């Protein structure tokens, strides 16, 4: 009646595991920058969608808003940052993250790391964030482990 979800965010690597199996893994050098988004079915944990939005670059946040607005309220939403996700994470995207109940997403800054798991229509199940300590540095890696309640019937 739960999913065991692990979410890792860091300078050089992201992964998401569901029930002990990796559903997203990106350790490649200069690829996959930005906010990775995974959508799960809330009864089975099956992956319904996997995206990456390079929100270090313009226009990617607008794509993220359009995509997230089409996700159904009951889905499990998972976000994780690789490298840098904030430079072009602008106010409409930050407001949308706030509407999910995210505390760190709306405040995401330069080279911060961030892991998030929540039901789209609420509540948030888990969240971790590490602030970069200097412009030339990254947040520390964060590994979030959350038991997500499953729906049924
Ligand atoms: C050449 C280089 O280091 N580029 C990196 C880039 O490095 C920067 C170095 C200096 C500045 N600056 O504005 O002074 C910006 C990015 O940072 C990006 C976000 O972390 C990285 O994705 C990118 O690989």
Swiss-Prot record:
Q: What does the entry note on its domains?
A: Amino acid residues between 299-311 are important for both protein expression and enzymatic activity. The minimal catalytic domain is located between positions 299-651. Single amino acid substitutions in the stem domain from MEB patients abolished the activity of the membrane-bound form but not the soluble form. This suggests that the stem domain of the soluble form is unnecessary for activity, but that some amino acids play a crucial role in the membrane-bound form.
Q: What is the effect of changing residue 60 to K?
A: In RP76; reduced acetylglucosaminyltransferase activity
Q: What is the effect of changing residue 111 to A?
A: Decreased enzyme activity. Impairs protein stability
Protein name according to UniProt: Protein O-linked-mannose beta-1,2-N-acetylglucosaminyltransferase 1
| Tissues expressing the protein | Constitutively expressed. An additional weaker band is also detected in spinal cord, lymph node, and trachea. Expressed especially in astrocytes. Also expressed in immature and mature neurons.
First-to-last residue of the parent protein present: 97 to 249 of 660
Concerning its family, UniProt says: Belongs to the glycosyltransferase 13 family.
Residues bound to a carbohydrate: 33, 83, 111
Q: Domain GG-type lectin: where?
A: 1-153
Per UniProt, subcellular location reads as: Golgi apparatus membrane
Q: Which disease is it linked to?
A: Muscular dystrophy-dystroglycanopathy congenital with brain and eye anomalies A3: An autosomal recessive disorder characterized by congenital muscular dystrophy, ocular abnormalities, cobblestone lissencephaly, and cerebellar and pontine hypoplasia. Patients present severe congenital myopia, congenital glaucoma, pallor of the optic disks, retinal hypoplasia, intellectual disability, hydrocephalus, abnormal electroencephalograms, generalized muscle weakness and myoclonic jerks. Included diseases are the more severe Walker-Warburg syndrome and the slightly less severe muscle-eye-brain disease. Muscular dystrophy-dystroglycanopathy congenital with impaired intellectual development B3: An autosomal recessive disorder characterized by congenital muscular dystrophy associated with intellectual disability and mild structural brain abnormalities. Clinical features include intellectual disability, white matter changes, cerebellar cysts, pontine hypoplasia, myopia, optic atrophy, decreased alpha-dystroglycan on muscle biopsy and increased serum creatine kinase.
**Could you tell me the superkingdom of the organism this chain comes from?**
Eukaryota
Record text on subunit structure and interactions: Interacts with DAG1 (via O-linked mannose moiety). Interacts (via transmembrane domain) with FKTN; the interaction is direct and is required for normal location in Golgi membranes.
Function according to Swiss-Prot or TrEMBL:
Participates in O-mannosyl glycosylation by catalyzing the addition of N-acetylglucosamine to O-linked mannose on glycoproteins. Catalyzes the synthesis of the GlcNAc(beta1-2)Man(alpha1-)O-Ser/Thr moiety on alpha-dystroglycan and other O-mannosylated proteins, providing the necessary basis for the addition of further carbohydrate moieties. Is specific for alpha linked terminal mannose and does not have MGAT3, MGAT4, MGAT5, MGAT7 or MGAT8 activity.
Mutation: residue 83 to A; reported impact is: Moderately increased enzyme activity. Decreased affinity for N-acetylglucosamine
